[PDB]
């Protein structure tokens with residue numbers, strides 16, 4: 001089981017509960033946790049390994 | 061095969077490829093695709109089935 005380093009809750013792959021994300025570096029998060037973190041910084045930086053993915057993170 | 065309805069490219073979770081997301085409804089996207097979509101509306105609404113997840117989608 002993997003835990004989200006942002007909220008410290010378990011990230012669960014099953015359907016029912018909270019949406020999830022898996023970064024290109026392999027670290028996993030809840031979708032709203034990592035999305036809010038990307039929004040605060042404006043880049044897709046992993047809060048764990050600090051790697052920055054060169055995606056297209058847009059606000060609108 | 062899993063296709064992202066937003067950009068129509070394959071969603072490949074198990075790879076050093078683009079980051080991916082799985083919504084609570086089961087639908088899968090690229091993280092930047094679905095992140096940018098949620099950012100336009102402020103709501104975690106699946107564009108495929110229109111279900112709304114009551115998460116905390118923050119901009120800062």
Ligand SMILES: [Zn+2]
Nearest residue numbers: 004007030033
């Ligand atoms: Zn979390």
Ligand SMILES: [Zn+2]
Nearest residue numbers: 025027046049
């Ligand atoms: Zn990482």
Ligand SMILES: [Zn+2]
Nearest residue numbers: 064067090093
């Ligand atoms: Zn996409």
Ligand SMILES: [Zn+2]
Nearest residue numbers: 085087106109
């Ligand atoms: Zn859906």
